[PDB]
Write a protein that binds this ligand. Structure first.
Ligand SMILES: Cn1nc(C(=O)NCCc2ccc(S(C)(=O)=O)cc2)c2ccccc21
Ligand SMILES: [Zn+2]
Length: 140
């Protein structure tokens, strides 16, 4: 679990969004595993605006933050896991690292701020849903 709190927005994994998130929906895209809802209180996170390929991510299944190199956001075939079937996911970045389903929502960050959130994993890779192209998170 986990979310990004930027301005009056809450960014979560679409597959983990709550009824309150859907009832206060700003934007969602199933192909990216992202959902954005509106909040009453403002948040403290800053979104990175950059093309970094190195950063640090939080892994809840290890209680640890790990430094990683990751690929640029791409359309990737995600293999079937125990709870979800094989499917294509867009704006996804991959790194070599540990992840389990419950790690989704952990932040990946670079020197410029939040890059994305853990969204996929398996075969020793962790995938992050990018948020750096969502420029509107910075206003209104
Ligand atoms: C980190 N990590 N995550 C997963 C995982 O299954 N994520 C769900 C991926 C997912 C995205 C979008 C939808 S949608 C919006 O199309 O319904 C459903 C599912 C995973 C598995 C195995 C090891 C690691 C893992
Ligand atoms: Zn950066």
């Amino acid at each position: 679990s986990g979310a990004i709190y930027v301005g009056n927005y809450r960014v979560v994994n679409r597959h983990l969004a709550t009824h309150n998130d859907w009832a206060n929906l700003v934007w969602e895209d199933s192909s990216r595993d992202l959902l954005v809802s509106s909040t009453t209180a403002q948040g403290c996170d800053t979104i990175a605006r950059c093309d970094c390929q190195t950063g640090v991510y939080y892994c809840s299944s290890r209680r640890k933050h790990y430094p990683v190199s990751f690929s640029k956001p791409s359309l990737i075939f995600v293999e079937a896991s125990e709870y979800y079937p094989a499917r294509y996911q867009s704006h996804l970045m991959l790194a070599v690292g540990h992840s389990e389903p419950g790690d989704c929502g952990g932040i990946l960050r670079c020197q410029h701020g939040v890059v994305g959130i853990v969204s996929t994993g398996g075969n020793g890779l962790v995938g992050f849903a990018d948020v750096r192209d969502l420029l509107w998170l910075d206003e209104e």
